[PDB]
Structure 1
Amino acid sequence: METIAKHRHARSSAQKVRLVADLIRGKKVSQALDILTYTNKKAAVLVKKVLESAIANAEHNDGADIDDLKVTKIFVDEGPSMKRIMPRAKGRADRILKRTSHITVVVSDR
């Protein structure tokens, strides 16, 4: 059986986060945690917290066992953008986009 954890409206573009997510797809939870610990990326911290939350939900709500868990599904989706104005030379103006994303993690005994 599956358990889900999510983090919506994260301040990071989906392209940057997807790089970290590909590392742990299909791996065991114990091995996945070690990989994220020694990755020097900002997105690694964000993904680590989501993974830990999913594991915690398993025992309290589903009564699973740590040793039998592994990462079955993981994906990132684009979120709403924020509009800002950046002045340029000669009186011209430019539009700036600040992108967000949604992070989903699924852990199962399969």
Structure 2
Amino acid sequence: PGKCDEITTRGYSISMSVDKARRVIDQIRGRSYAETLMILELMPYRACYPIFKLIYSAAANASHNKQFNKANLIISKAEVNKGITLKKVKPRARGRSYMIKRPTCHITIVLRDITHFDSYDKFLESLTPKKLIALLGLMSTGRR
């Protein structure tokens, strides 16, 4: 859970295919809200616009539910899953019939502010662990 850092926004099963939503969602991973704001303004995809709608309604969410800024805010994971697929019995010649599936997505985009401490030096102190819980909230290479 990261101790109250991220903002998770889900999405409806929108009426488009999952894979093109996954190339346009694998583009904007890791980049902050300004770069995705200018790229998804100009990306030449039809899957671009509900993704930009969910980023916009995700950072406006992050500014109204929480109280953050739209500049120190990077996209955390932005996972796109499968949805419900409709079945369309479409006839074709020599008396055949083909199932044409209408696919839907399931977009869940997580946003991530930097709410940091930015400690002065690195040097380890193996004392007062009930302060070591609070001083270390998000770091790397956890030993013991």
| TM-score of the aligned structures, taking structure 2 as reference length | 0.72
Deviations 1:1-60, CA, capped at 9 Å, x for gaps: 111222121111111110111111000111111111111100001100000011111121
Greater strand content: 1
Aligned twin of 1:26: 30
| RMSD, matched Cα | 1.1
Gaps of 5+ in 1: none
Q: SS at the partner of 2:94?
A: helix
What does residue range 9-20 of structure 1 map to in structure 2 within 5 Å? 9-20=13-24
**TM-score (normalizing by structure 1):** 0.93
DSSP 3-state at the match of 2:8: strand
Moved over 4 A (4+): none
Normalized per residue, the structure richer in helix is: 1
1:72 to 72, 76, 99: 76
1:61 counterpart residue number: 65
**Quick one: higher RCO (CA 8 Å, sep 6+), 1 or 2?**
1
Report the residue type matching 1:32 in the other structure: T
